[model samples]
Target: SLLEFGKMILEETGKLAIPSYSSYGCYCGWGGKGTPKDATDRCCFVHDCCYGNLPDCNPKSDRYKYKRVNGAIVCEKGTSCENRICECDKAAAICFRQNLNTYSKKYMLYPDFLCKGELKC
Candidate 1:
């Protein structure tokens, strides 16, 4: 019963499939090229697949500029500057079972830690 539920969650979340391996590491393969290595490899797990640009663009004009790292999102460097852009400093979202070590972790059902209150009865 538990295994079935785990499968269902993985299928629903698009985490069941292994994305084509990259030189950097494994990723979900949802976002397109130009995606930052950190964002593509790590952040894509929790955030919407389309949340960031395949290659991040200028926040003001949405023009393609620099590619992002795994954990960053493209945004303006400062409120007043339109010419400068950089990754968002805020933390990125975590997806379940996206990492290789997850399978070995005691909780093979999910890679992320769940809150005590949210555990299923």
Candidate 2:
């Protein structure tokens, strides 16, 4: 962890080619410090936090339900809260795509030291 953090500090000073967010790390699987691996993972973190702030638009909420039509899944956008939740997820999607190169198995495994977990690495 120290190694990653040190690298990040160097990156901040423009002393590394690896870039920033390397130390933030990522926990792709379930349960960990919830640190993001890179830009792509940061998008996920943002999306998750956005959902956390919208209890009224959670999966358990009736208005938060989704529908499947012709193999396509669509979320309910009937309410303002639901629209906001959709916006959050949509923005996250755009961010992930913009940083697509940052998503890799290297950061999804414990061996990489950029992640924390034993599965899906």
Candidate 3:
């Protein structure tokens, strides 16, 4: 029985697959033309993907913007939509900090050429 189950597991695992993102960049900013300048841009890339995961989410929505409180940035908890947008930006900030060393000034203007205008998710 153990051997039979193991064979089944092996067969199922072989049928499954994992995919990685091939797109990265600043996306629509001045830096949109080049590939991701560094990890900082990749953070934005993934953040865009995360937001797109939700039917109601997009970078243009005011809901995704962080709030200013006493000179600090924060995400206010609210509805399901609000919660996810906050999480996306929150994760993005953390990624930027963690990869601060790889960041470049050029990223400010670097636009995303790969991430947009394609099938996402």
TM-score of each: 0.20, 0.50, 0.52
**After superposition, which runs of candidate 3 have C-alpha atoms over 4 Å from their true positions?**
1-25, 28-35, 62-76, 111-121
Among these predicted structures, which one has the highest TM-score? 3
Residue pairs in candidate 3 whose N, alpha carbon or C atoms collide under 3 angstroms: 27-112, 30-109, 31-109, 31-110, 31-111, 32-110, 32-111, 32-112
For model 3, where is the 10-residue window of minimal lDDT? Answer: 15-24
For model 1, what is the error of residue 101's alpha carbon versus the real structure, in angstroms, after optimal superposition? Answer: 3.3
Q: Model 2: per-residue lDDT, tens digit, 7-113?
A: 32242233331333332245222324445656766665665566667766652232333444653335556577766665554454445446756556455433434
Sequence-dependent TM-score of model 1: 0.20
Q: Which has the higher TM-score value, candidate number 1 or candidate number 3?
A: 3
Please provide, for model 1 over 8-72, each residue's C-alpha lDDT reduced to its tens digit, 9 standing for 90 to 100. 22443444433222122222333233333343344433232323332343332433232236533
* Count of clashes, each model: 9, 2, 8
Candidate 2, residue 24: lDDT: 29
User: With candidate 3 superimposed using the best TM-score fit, by how many Å does residue 33's alpha carbon deviate from the native?
Assistant: 8.1
Q: What is the descending TM-score order?
A: 3, 2, 1
**Model 2 misplaced stretches (Cα beyond 4 Å):** 1-32, 59-77, 109-121
Q: After superposition, how far is residue 119 of candidate 1 from its true place, in Å?
A: 17
Cα error, residue 115 of model 1, in Å, equals 24
Backbone clash pairs for candidate 1 read 34-54, 34-55, 35-54, 36-68, 37-70, 38-69, 38-70, 38-71, 39-70
Q: Give me the displacement of residue 73 in model 1, in angstroms.
A: 9.8
> Considering TM-score, which of the candidate structures 2 and 3 is the better prediction for this target?
3
